[PDB]
Amino acid sequence: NGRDSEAKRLGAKRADGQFVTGGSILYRQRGTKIYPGENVGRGGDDTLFAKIDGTVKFERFGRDRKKVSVYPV
Amino acid sequence: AKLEITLKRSVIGRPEDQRVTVRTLGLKKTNQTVVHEDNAAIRGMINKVSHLVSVKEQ
Amino acid sequence: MPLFQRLPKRGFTNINRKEYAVVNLDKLNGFAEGTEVTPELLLETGVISKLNAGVKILGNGKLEKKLTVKANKFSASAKEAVEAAGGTAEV
Amino acid sequence: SKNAARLKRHARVRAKLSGTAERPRLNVFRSNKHIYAQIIDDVNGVTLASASTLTSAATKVGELVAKRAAEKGISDVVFDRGGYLYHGRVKALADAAREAGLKF
RNA sequence: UGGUGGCGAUAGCGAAGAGGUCACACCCGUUCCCAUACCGAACACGGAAGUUAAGCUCUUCAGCGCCGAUGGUAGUCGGGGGUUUCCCCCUGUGAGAGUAGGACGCCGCCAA
RNA sequence: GGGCGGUCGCCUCCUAAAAGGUAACGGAGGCGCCCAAAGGUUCCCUCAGAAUGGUUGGAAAUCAUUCGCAGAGUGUAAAGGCACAAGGGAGCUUGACUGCGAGACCUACAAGUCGAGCAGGGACGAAAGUCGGGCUUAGUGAUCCGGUGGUUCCGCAUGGAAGGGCCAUCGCUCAACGGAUAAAAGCUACCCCGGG
RNA sequence: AGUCUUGGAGGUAGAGCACUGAUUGGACUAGAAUUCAGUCAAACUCCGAAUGCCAAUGACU
CATH number at residue D25: 3.30.420.100
Q: List, in order, residues 6 or more apart from A12 with CB less than 8 Å away.
A: A27
- Kind and range of the H or E run holding B45: helix B40-48
Our count of domains for chain C comes to: 1
Contact B3, B36 (CB under 8 A): yes
Helix/strand/coil for C81: helix
Report the nucleotide nearest the CA of residue A34, measured to C1'. F81
Could you list the beta-strand ranges (E) of B1-58.
Answer: 3-7, 33-36, 53-56
CA-to-C1' distance for C45 and E2, Å? Answer: 98
Provide the positions of strand F that have an atom within 7 A of a protein CB. Answer: 7-8, 10-14, 16, 19-22, 25-30, 43-45, 79-82, 84-86, 102-107, 109-110, 112-116, 125-129, 134-137, 142-145, 154-156, 164-166, 178-179
Structural fold of domain B1-58: Ribosomal Protein L30; Chain: A, (3.30.1390)
Is C72 domain-assigned? Answer: yes
Cα separation, D104 vs D94, in Å, equals 8
Cα separation, B27 vs C73, in Å, equals 76
Q: Which domain holds residue C43?
A: 20-89
A57 phi and psi angles, rounded to 5 deg: -135, 170
Resolution in A: 3.4
Contact C38, C47 (CB under 8 A): no
Q: Give the method used.
A: cryo-EM
Contact C78, C46 (CB under 8 A): no
Nearest C-alpha neighbor of D89 from the set D50, D53, D54, D43 = D53
Is C42 domain-assigned? Answer: yes
Exposure string (b/e) for D75-88, b if CB count within 10 Å is 16 or more? eebebbbbbbeeee
Q: List, in order, residues 6 or more apart from D16 with CB less than 8 Å away.
A: none
Q: Are strands C89-90 and C69-70 parallel, antiparallel or unpaired?
A: parallel
- Kind and range of the H or E run holding D35: strand D35-40
Does the C-beta of B55 come within 7 A of strand G?
no
Contact D75, D44 (CB under 8 A): no
Cα separation, C88 vs C83, in Å, equals 7
List beta partners, residue D38: D27, D50
CA-to-C1' distance for D13 and E69, Å? Answer: 43
Tally: H helices and E strands in chain D: 4, 4
Cα separation, D28 vs A39, in Å, equals 29
Q: Gaps (C–N > 2.5 Å) in chain D: which residues precede them?
A: 54
CATH number at residue C63: 3.100.10.10
Residue-range domain boundaries for chain A: 10-73
Torsion of CA D61, D67, D71, D75, to 10 degrees: 110
Q: Which domain holds residue D69?
A: 16-104
Cα separation, D75 vs D83, in Å, equals 25
CA-to-C1' distance for A44 and F31, Å? Answer: 22
Does the C-beta of B36 come within 7 A of strand G?
yes
List beta partners, residue C73: C56
Our count of domains for chain D comes to: 1
Name the H helices within D22-89: 57-61, 64-69
Q: What is the largest CA-CA distance in chain A?
A: 52
